[PDB]
Each structure stands twice: as structure tokens, then as C-alpha cells.
Amino acid sequence: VLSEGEWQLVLHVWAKVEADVAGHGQDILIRLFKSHPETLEKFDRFKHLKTEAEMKASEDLKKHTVTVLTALGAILKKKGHHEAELKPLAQSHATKHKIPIKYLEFISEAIIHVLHSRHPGDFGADAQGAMNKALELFRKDIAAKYKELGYQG
Numbered sequence: 001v002l003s004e005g006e007w008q009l010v011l012h013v014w015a016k017v018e019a020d021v022a023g024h025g026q027d028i029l030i031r032l033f034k035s036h037p038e039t040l041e042k043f044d045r046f047k048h049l050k051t052e053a054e055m056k057a058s059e060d061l062k063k064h065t066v067t068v069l070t071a072l073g074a075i076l077k078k079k080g081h082h083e084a085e086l087k088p089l090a091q092s093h094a095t096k097h098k099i100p101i102k103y104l105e106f107i108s109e110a111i112i113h114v115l116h117s118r119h120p121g122d123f124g125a126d127a128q129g130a131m132n133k134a135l136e137l138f139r140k141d142i143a144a145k146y147k148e149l150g151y152q153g
């Protein structure tokens with residue numbers, strides 16, 4: 001369970017993401033695909049993309065990243081009270097997309113990397129610790145739902 005102080009550190013950096021969610025989204029998914037290329041294979045819609053330049057140029061990818069970060073932002077804003085938000089997300093990611101917990105760890109790494117790079121003013125050590133805790137909570141709660149849904153993860 002995160003403290004209110006920890007949630008405020010999470011939300012204060014998220015406020016900066018929201019200046020330009022699309023640009024942050026592109027950076028995060030591209031970082032994921034670069035660091036862990038196997039993750040790209042889960043996206044039938046995007047797996048044809050060969051290079052960072054192609055990824056950056058894809059309007060379709062950009063739009064998807066906005067969807068992803070907006071969904072995550074809505075979860076974070078619930079400050080742990082995210083049961084309603086996690087239900088549809090866990091179901092689609094377990095049963096339609098088949099995304100293991102390991103891959104959610106990878107995207108968490110990418111989020112932390114991009115925030116660390118872009119936002120040193122709001123992503124010092126304590127703030128990064130808080131974001132790590134928030135993403136760990138998200139992954140733990142998704143993992144529990146995965147199990148309930150019949151997916152090993």
C-alpha cells in the first residue's frame with residue numbers, strides 16, 4: 001500500500017507526462033521495443049516496423065501509445081482503488097493479447113527509463129521509488145486477476 005506522499009510523487013510526474021502524452025507514449029513503447037524486441041511480436045498491428053524511425057513515423061502507433069498511457073494514468077489517479085479499471089485490462093491482456101507479467105515488468109522499466117530521462121525535476125530518487133511502487137502494485141493486482149481469469153502470466 002502506497003502512502004499519500006508516495007501517490008503525490010507519482011501524480012506530480014504524471015502531470016508533466018500530460019503536457020504531451022503522445023510524445024511520452026512514443027518514447028515509452030519505442031524504448032520497450034528496443035530493449036526487449038520480443039515484446040513487439042505481441043503486436044500484430046505493429047510488428048512489421050523495422051526501425052526506430054519507422055516507429056516514430058507511425059501515426060497508428062502514436063495513437064495506441066496515447067490509449068495506453070491514458071489507461072495507465074486513470075489507474076494511477078485512483079491511488080490503488082483501481083478494481084474497475086483493472087477488470088477489462090486484465091481480461092484483454094490475459095486472453096486476447098496474452099501478455100506475461102514479465103512483459104509488464106519490461107514496460108514498467110521503459111516507463112521509468114523515459115521519466116528518468118525527460119523529468120529529472122520530478123523524478124529524483126524518492127519520486128522514482130514511488131513510481132516503482134505504483135507500477136509494482138499495478139503488476140501485482142493484474143497478476144492476481146490473471147490467475148482468477150485462468151492465465152498463468
Ligand code: HEM
Pocket residue numbers: 039040042043044045067068069071072088089092093097099103104107
Ligand atoms: C502499462 C501497461 C499497459 C497498459 C496500461 C496497456 C493498455 C492497453 C489498452 C488500454 C489497450 C486497448 C484496449 C485493450 O485491448 O485492453 C491495449 C491493447 C493492447 N496491448 Fe496493452 N497495455 C499495457 C501493456 C502491454 C504490453 C507490455 C504489451 C505487449 C508486450 C501489450 C500488448 C497489447 C496489444 C497487442 C494490444 C492490442 C493492440 C491492437 O492491435 O490494437 N500491452 N493495451
